[PDB]
């Protein structure tokens, strides 16, 4: 089991860390959503699908920078939605193929009443998402850590 991004950077077997740079909508209105869709960025696969089943969860999701200060919302994961930042581990997603499959995670953040001006700065860190992978075979318990960065500034009208 190993995951990689759309620009090619990969995390090998056993877990690790990587960086992701996402393009955000330059403006968000009050009462609207800022959508951060990572199902088009992170993909993984099962190396031995004939004999092993891999289970994947979102162990933790934390907010940083402007997302922490100016936003609130939920996270979409495998048929349901949960508060973001997370308060517990999610259900499990099954990986059973050698072909890459999306990691179905998306953020839905709304501006708080104090948000105004440049809410998120370009090149800054907005979230850290931990991917926990177990299996059907042994005691392997690995963490794939993803750091999410903003590729542009986001403004909120006041």
């Amino acid at each position: 089991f190993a995951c990689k991004t759309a620009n090619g950077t990969a995390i090998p077997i056993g877990g690790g860390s990587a960086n992701v740079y996402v393009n955000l909508a330059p403006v968000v209105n009050v009462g609207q959503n800022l959508v951060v869709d990572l199902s088009t960025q992170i993909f993984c696969h099962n190396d031995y699908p004939e004999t092993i089943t891999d289970y994947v969860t979102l162990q933790r999701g934390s907010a940083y920078g402007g997302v922490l200060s100016n936003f609130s919302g939920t996270v979409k994961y495998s048929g349901s939605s949960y508060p973001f930042p997370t308060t517990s581990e999610t259900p499990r997603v099954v990986y059973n193929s050698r072909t890459d499959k999306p990691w179905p995670v998306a953020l839905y953040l709304t501006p708080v009443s104090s948000a105004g001006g440049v809410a998120i700065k370009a090149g800054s860190l907005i979230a850290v998402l931990i991917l926990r992978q177990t299996n059907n075979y042994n005691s392997d318990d690995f963490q794939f850590v993803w750091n999410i960065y903003a590729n542009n500034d986001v403004v909120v009208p006041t």
Partner: antibody, heavy 125, light 107 residues
Framework: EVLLKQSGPEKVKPGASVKIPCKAS????????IDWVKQSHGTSLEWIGH????????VYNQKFRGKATLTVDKSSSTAYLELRSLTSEDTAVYYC??????????????????WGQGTSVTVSS | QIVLTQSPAIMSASLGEEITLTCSAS?????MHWYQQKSGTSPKILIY???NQASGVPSRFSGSGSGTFYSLTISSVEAEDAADYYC?????????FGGGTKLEIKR
């Protein structure tokens, strides 16, 4: 089709104030945002500010913060630009434009996709 | 503030030829957009997100680039292309336009 209409050319005295309307038609006014652009000396372009018709919120270029004010009249589907203490450096053509920002767009299309004909402002005695 | 520079300020080309315009930024931006303004009218969106033709735009206009260098290429230049072109970015706040590049037609 989609039409934005501004007032005709305006002549003002130095130190006075002007308010330029911009009326929208052919589309739902509150489903899009509004931008204002200044064209000075015939070629230079600079963005003034951004407005949300639903709430009247604004994002300003700090260059124009003390000079321009953006306002809306939701009932009449009209947006207004007001210039405070006009000087000779304010002689330019002012555009309103419909922008597709404010909300998420699946195709990632964020632009000023419709422009009204400009309003030429002359500041002279 | 990010400064966009278009050089040279005026360039010329002949009917059916192929010409490229360039825009360079004082810092790295994620996207570039192009507007066209013909004589006696307001600007009109031509290329958005560095590569996408706007609605009702012939496929002879195309864009490419990254980082701090971007370019707009016109193939099979026609007489209708005598206009002014501006590069625009909204990746950084505040948003800025380019200086402008006029296209002339040799005949």
């Amino acid at each position: 089709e989609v039409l934005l209409k501004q007032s005709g050319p305006e002549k003002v005295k130095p130190g006075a104030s002007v308010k330029i309307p911009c009326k929208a038609s052919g589309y739902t006014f509150t489903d899009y945002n509004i931008d204002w652009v200044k064209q000075s000396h015939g070629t230079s372009l600079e963005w003034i500010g951004h407005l949300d018709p639903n709430s009247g919120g604004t994002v300003y270029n700090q260059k124009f913060r003390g000079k321009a004010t953006l306002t809306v009249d939701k009932s009449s589907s009209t947006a207004y630009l007001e210039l405070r203490s006009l000087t000779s450096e304010d002689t330019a053509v002012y555009y309103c434009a419909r922008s597709t920002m404010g909300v998420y767009r699946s195709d990632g299309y964020y632009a000023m996709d419709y422009w009204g004909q400009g309003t030429s402002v002359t500041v002279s005695s | 503030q990010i400064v966009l520079t278009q050089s040279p300020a005026i360039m010329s080309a002949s009917l059916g030829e192929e010409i490229t315009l360039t825009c360079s930024a004082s810092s790295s931006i994620s996207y570039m957009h192009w507007y066209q303004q013909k004589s006696g009218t307001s600007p009109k969106i031509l290329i958005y997100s560095t590569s996408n033709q706007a609605s009702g735009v012939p496929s002879r206009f195309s864009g490419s680039g990254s980082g701090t260098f971007y370019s707009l290429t016109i193939s099979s230049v026609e007489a209708e292309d005598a206009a002014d072109y501006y590069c625009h970015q909204w990746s950084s706040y505040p948003w800025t336009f380019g200086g402008g590049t006029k296209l002339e037609i040799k005949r």
